[PDB]
Amino acid sequence: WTEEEMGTAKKGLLEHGRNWSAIARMVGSKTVSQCKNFYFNYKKRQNLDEILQQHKLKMEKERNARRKKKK
Known part of the structure; x- marks a missing residue:
């Protein structure tokens, strides 16, 4: 697999x-x-593991922080 x-x-x-x-x-x-x-x-759970974990937390944190529409 080429880097592209x-x-x-x-x-x-x-x-x-x-x-x-x-x-x-x-x-x-x-x-x-x-x-x-x-x-x-290409079983390498270092780089790709971090790619998926970051994908999780980045979207998740701001998704909760934008639903502050609650008193």
């Missing part, structure tokens, strides 16, 4: 999350098993 499509897989796994169907349709454009098996070859 790795950046599209970074974008995919950030935006759509770990939904292998959405990712394998985005970067793979065919079969869910592509991104699933990809995850065992």
Whole structure:
């Protein structure tokens, strides 16, 4: 995987999350098993683990902070 499509897989796994169907349709454009098996070859829960954790907390914190519409 060239860093361009790795950046599209970074974008995919950030935006759509770990939904292998959405990712394998985005970067793979065919079969869910592509991104699933990809995850065992490029099995590195350091960089990508942090990408998903940051995706979680960034959206979640401001989503709660914007629902201050409550007395």
